[model samples]
Target: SGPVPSRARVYTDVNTHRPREYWDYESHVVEWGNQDDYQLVRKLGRGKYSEVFEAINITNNEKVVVKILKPVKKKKIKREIKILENLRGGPNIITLADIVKDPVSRTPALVFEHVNNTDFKQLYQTLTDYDIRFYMYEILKALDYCHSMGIMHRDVKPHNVMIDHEHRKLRLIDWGLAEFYHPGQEYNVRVASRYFKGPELLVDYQMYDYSLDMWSLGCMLASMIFRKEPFFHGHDNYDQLVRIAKVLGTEDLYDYIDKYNIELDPRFNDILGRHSRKRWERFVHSENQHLVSPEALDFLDKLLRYDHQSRLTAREAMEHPYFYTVVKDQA
Candidate 1:
């Protein structure tokens, strides 16, 4: 019906080669650090699952991000801890310094190394073409490293990507939605943000793997080059596909659904209409002339494929000609 083999093109056999204990995240138990050690300097922001803070290690005077979490399932906390521990030393992956739990109220928190991040809205505008290539290549390094170890960063967007523009440092932060990819194992499509969600997610075809991240990264790249906040600009999950369809087009979307035997929600029956895929050049303009180079569009097309298998692997993306200028230093 859909994809005969839903495994990712690269890293398809990663988990199989690794020990079961490595992917057995659910059984991992978290070890706690000193709960009273940190002092909150400022509140950063809040999400449904957690409240974040700019905090300090009172003993060492080190700054860190304190992500205070929900009265959450112990399993989720452990899974994140396992993934973070596994990914910690990889290039550009955010450092998880410590784990703490309030003794009195029993709340949990994750302490992470703070990267001084400028807001992407402001940062994107100020980014020189070299700046975009540098930071994006840094992100690709983290992704390639993680995917090699069989992890899929379900959330890959500007919001979760921390960059210190002045220093040109980039960190792929937030492992909350990340999961260990096991071949043919169906996964939750509800993991990523609507605009960054791939067709496999929107169409409810669940055997998706690491390539899901490439789609999100592509969306982030498109927004940067085109100067749009969210390139897809979907209203909701279903409409998210509609927005993607408008550019990638409705026909490929239908073919995607047909190949996957995805049961498209009838809600799309009325709204989904004929759309020939637009050429990538259409998004270029005098305003975004610096960012929208010919190579950028080609790199984007490779990542933003209707078929997840067709999307470039993280290692492949780093080697793309679009990144060659930056990759010359080639870490």
Candidate 2:
């Protein structure tokens, strides 16, 4: 068995902000620690907040991916912990095993379920048609689950999705940029991958819905199928939307902003930013050299909608004709 919790549970004795030497993974499994009890097997990667590493959980005969914070703000670490705490039992969402802090570097860390396969960004490069369909279904399913729980993954890029080779399942990661929808808390910070970020995001539109994730999913799906160019160019926010406008065409794209009551950051009023989306559409459509099927084109069209509220919802997307085998039979 594992270490047992103290019979006299002293919640006041322990500081939630203070670090511990070890975790009693039985009843007190949720504690954060400051130690090197877990050895780093190899470096995984680095991000804005931290560096990740593969480590072994020797006591339980398990392995985990750990994100070691790189001198980030205390508030940011706490916020990320909150997101992980909420996703405890979510379907296809990567599991958080524990939170660990290293006393040596005084850095915060995250222990997560180690995944086996590469991210979808790399996976899509070598996929067949069957693989493309399967990955898309999995990504959509993950988004559907998150949306149902009122969580928006604001960033839904391929790099955030991991595909399991042994289980043939998809796991969504990186909730550090998520926003929970609720009354009076509508405007969260603008955060997303530049290319996958929606027009609503680029246009400084902050008040929006889970549909933003849907837009990103559609872009990823198209990129996977194309196997060549990016669905939207991976440029700065404004330039990316210009690419989206090009593909979807630019007719009254911003008309839905007022109707849906989405709020934009005030910096957008003075510049050509008001009509910038129109400029983007002209560039993408005129320059698209690759030919796409009408069905796929239609799906991408909905995702790239200028009106943030008009974009597809996760559930709505799954029910679309493109998902139906009968429709493909006709195509």
Candidate 3:
């Protein structure tokens, strides 16, 4: 990795003026909570890094989520814990009730406030156009809040976004891939899920910032509006870029890489070909036309840009016209 510059030059000072101690994960001393206090109810779900279980606090019989981490480096465990604690009171963030471990096995677990969330695949199908706009606004609040605090949630997908439609509540969950942002630093591009990965990630641009989350948000929005599980369906990493290029055009990607002095992986040469930017109108259909509007299309265009900086920041996204009606109706 040589000297690779960022697509967005504005936020380079984001973490510079902030207190180093606030973002220092390695320096924090973790005090593990008591595992015996919570009684496991049943398995909730499983991730690549952890097995989630529904649990109850024996002390008060309150329901909670117990996320038991798989065997991993101690540093990774500490990083997740540190980020959750730091963002505890931030808007729409999942509350971390406790951090416990098995006394004998030394296996760590994160206890989080329970959120009654439906499977996104099923839930998205049941949402109205207004519901989609309203919920996406809530997601933006969490993103803007975290970015303002100098944190980047590397993983922002439907799986990580918990929604309780009954209460109209949203919790941005899973801090395992989250990291503190430092200016001029190259971060791991291996973060985020296959479909939700930003162009910066697929092209091996490591100096990405909070703008990455906006890209993931766009993918989620596209899915909701077009009924595509993934807006960009890539079978593999190399194909991920091709999937993105098919929509955003290949020339912009070349311009982006050239401007940043990014030397893309040689594997891209075999498949990388010219493509013209596809129109958002092409996705409109009878099933999703109700969700489609000029504002919605405009917002998607801004978010799904090949250049990360060309995309809207969370704060700016909140002010977009697509959410204006939702904001007015809610207010």
Candidate 4:
């Protein structure tokens, strides 16, 4: 409704999965180093839930990036660490390098392999098309692995994806919002920037799946190809959809409503006008298909499917025509 939404609406909600008592945004030192493991050099960045810093590993003398939750209590800190532990490996994924516990505060800090070059946002602002595609290719491979492990990243955006310029590698970082999938459960209603969130997330919050990340992957790729145009212009979810409709042509769900093969939950039918579904289907079908290679197009087509259940499996996407076409030559 407004140019910029209020801060309260941006970070908190009655159904906000994780509520905060207070957010320490001052970027203060909690305890300095994590035991004898790594020494914090300085604050790199800070946020409502966490703070990240540039640090050095004492044991190996290697440089690292440490993300520390700003909460004071041990329990809150431990809860975050548990989620971080599951994100340890996957070449395209950031390495948890090591974790150090603040003895005084007992708050845990994560040491990740330091990636240089820049975050994807900056890369988006300045990379050539071929290089962007190379990074997108690597990020997709990382996502493919995450899916096989049944981890839903939920949050995928340019800022969280970092580049290792020296080696030309794209690494996925920041798994704080990630969750393990159970057969059927009502997931918390969370949002990952209106622009990057998938239609499934935008419409039915109850139905969750790994494929949502694929929708985001498509957005990320599109942002790179179009120089951060399209979905990136939205003010919120509704605005994002409007921008999408303009590009993909008006979104609507009427056609899929009666299709038995349509795997999306019926609950979404009422989320928007019948024309909404029609527009989304057309948008999915009309994206930058020409810009993508045949193999890449095939993998992206499955990833961008409107029906979440019918979307490609993580393993399937990795082994799909796209990755294999690139992987075989690389191998």
Candidate 5:
């Protein structure tokens, strides 16, 4: 969104070698699908950008999720559809079966393959240590594939990860905030949810890349192992940084900002005080001790780094020892 930076990191789009149009979402033509073939059954959920409903294909009798877009820019709608189409065959990615628009109101809807997803708040608590590793590894497959294709899923929270535990299926859904990674292109710092935002985002470092997703995934993993809904429970965006600084330490945050030549927001001066980095072991408790181990703690340390460039990529993460136990069982 700004002038290309003279200095940038290598992992920004490590495997991307596609033509400009291949990654261009706005110019891609959208082929609208039939609306008459599906009927609404019930509401599934709602988010900031869309109203979701459980619907059935009257013709094929197949159940689907109908995500009707709220009144937003036409460009944003096309971007989501284009990204879904581009990632259609990727591992563990939600399938966009159809795109339909209401004839009268002109409201646009995207139909996706229905996932028998149990809410994470209710599901993670019931999972074993093995279950946690297996599913987290499964999501890495999705992230690695998407990153290889030159896309970044800015939002990677637990709610966006759908787990059909009965079938052991995991789908990484919601591409509304996802975008193509153009090296040195400064993107919107306000993309992800507050709790999962990386140090780069909180400090207004705009040249962030796919590593941003790794930070969010780390947040999700932290919650599962620590028994907290959001590992960084910030009251607001400003407080979000405060919450993160409380753990990662304010000095580490300043070092990252300084390395990138970033100017801290004026508001942060009042809130930013010195904080020593908190140990991951500090979060261990009787309830969550079963999920904690040397490997798990080491893995968390790598993913939750203050420097975005220092965080692990999805491919690197898949090779980490935290998943060694699960890999051995599969082998």
Candidate 6:
């Protein structure tokens, strides 16, 4: 569909030599755990895909997260299970404790190590400048580990990130939309949330790689530092591109499209108009200036690039000067 087939700059062959059992999720036979071991306590949250709840492992009386998936394709469940199994013990990777199913209803549930997290909407408002850098660095640890394992966490957003500020335990949760990265494959563009979607996704440049997560993280960082709930408030898929083009500039997008020989989706012709690249400084004001330093803006510029290949990888981002304080604290 598009011309420039992109591969991740680093770790391009992570799964190439792996056994079929590791990445071939479709063939996985469900070894469903016992559902009776845990009892639901209260509803945690809801999503379009599954029922999230706080549950207790009655055997040990330990709190756990029970993600009871709604009606979904069997393959989706298998892929989630395989991805979770593959990412076991990775830094900041959410613990998938067990997979269970109700024998009567056949509804599958994933038991996970419970993390008491403050909602991002309420939490982001109170975070200090150093706090943002520290937490984002932790998130990069998770992203780098998963990407190194040949997985693209297509759903990298606030909701998928569980942050327990009190305990400082951060977990990159939700692997439902993640997929194994295969070089030269054209994946579905319908993976991430509307505001967090990269230009490659909005432009239907399907050969995108791990850099897609970088773009989403950039959007998240922008919102936090700029005090915007969502940096890009797109109404729909088409509007999503329009919102990005408005800030990153229409010309830059055109250049990216030409480099990749991308054929912009015909729907974009109606809404997309000429736009100038907004300076990063233009976003800073008295309200958020304390958090928007030169280093932070520079790091963000590298992440929110129209060319997916140009964006910083998770490891590179962690090394950026913006995180110098956090990096020093690591030791």
The Cα error of candidate 5 at residue 58, in Å, is 2.1
Residues 1-331, candidate 6: write the lDDT tens digits: 6387678898798888799888899999978889999999899888787899999999899999998989999998899999999999999999999999999998888999899999998999899999899999999999999999999999899999999999988999999999999888889998898999988888888888889999999999999999987999999989988988889899988899899999877888878889999998888999899999989899989999999889999999988999998988888
lDDT of 5 by residue, 1-331 (tens): 3222422243455435666667777788888878888999999878887999999999889999999988988888888888898899899999999999988887899999999998887899999888999998999999999888778999999889999999999999999999888876779988888999988888877887888999999999999988988899998888899999899898888887767677778999999788999989899999999988888889888999988788888988999999998779878
Q: Listing every candidate in turn, what is its Cα RMSD in Å to the true structure after a full C-alpha superposition?
A: 1.5, 11.1, 1.6, 9.6, 2.2, 1.2
Cα lDDT of model 4 by residue, 1-331, tens digit? 2111111111122223332321221222332344567788998889567798888888888888888867655543443445445445675888866666777787767677788746555545666545655676787777766655445678888777888776887788777666555445456646576778776555444546666787788777665544435444777665554455444333333332233223444543344432332322233333443344555446555666544556666556556655544566567
What are the clashing pairs of model 2? Answer: 242-280, 245-281, 246-280, 246-281, 246-284, 246-285
Candidate with the greatest TM-score versus the true structure: 6
| TM-score winner, 2 or 3 | 3
Q: Ten residues in a row with the worst lDDT in model 6? A: 1-10
Local accuracy of candidate 3 as per-residue lDDT tens digits, 1-331:
5745663444556666867767777887888888999999999989888999999999998999999989887888878888888888888999999989899998899999999998898899888989999999999989888888788898999999998888989999998899988777789998999999998888888888888999999999999998888889999989989998988898889998887788888899879788998898888999989988898998988898877878899988999999888889876
Q: Write the number of the candidate with greater TM-score, choosing between 2 and 6.
A: 6
What is the lDDT, from 0 to 100, of the residue 258 in candidate 5? Answer: 69
The clash number for model 1 is 2
The worst-scoring run of ten residues by lDDT in candidate 1 lies at: 1-10
Write down the RMSD of candidate 3 (Cα, Å). Answer: 1.6
Scored against the true structure, residue 156 in model 4 reaches a CA lDDT of: 89
TM-score of each: 0.96, 0.76, 0.96, 0.72, 0.95, 0.97
- Model 2 stretches with alpha carbons more than 4 Å out: 1-30, 34-37, 119-122, 184-189, 257-295, 325-331
For residue 250, what is the lDDT in candidate 1? 85
Write one digit per residue (lDDT tens) for candidate 1, span 1-331: 4455476788888889888878898878788999789999999999779999999999999999999998777788888899999998899999999999899988899999999999988778988888878888888999999999999999999999998877878899999889998888999888888889998988888899999999999999999888888899988888888888889988788887777777778898988788989998888888898888888989999999888888899988988999888967765
In terms of lDDT, the best-performing candidate is: 6
lDDT of 2 by residue, 1-331 (tens): 3211111111212222333311111222346764466788999889888798899887676788988877865555555566566666777888988888777666678888889866555655557655565566667787777666556778888778888855877789888787555423346546887778777667655556677787788778667655544668845665665566555544455455455454544543432243333322232342232324455556766766666556777667767766676335435
Better of 2 and 4 by TM-score: 2
Give the Cα lDDT of each candidate. Answer: 0.88, 0.64, 0.88, 0.59, 0.87, 0.91
Stretches off by above 4 angstroms in model 3 are 1-3, 7-11
Task: Indicate the worst ten consecutive residues by lDDT in candidate 5.
Answer: 1-10
Q: Which candidate, 1 or 4, has the higher TM-score?
A: 1
Clash counts per candidate, in order, are 2, 6, 0, 12, 0, 0
lDDT of model 5 at position 241: 90
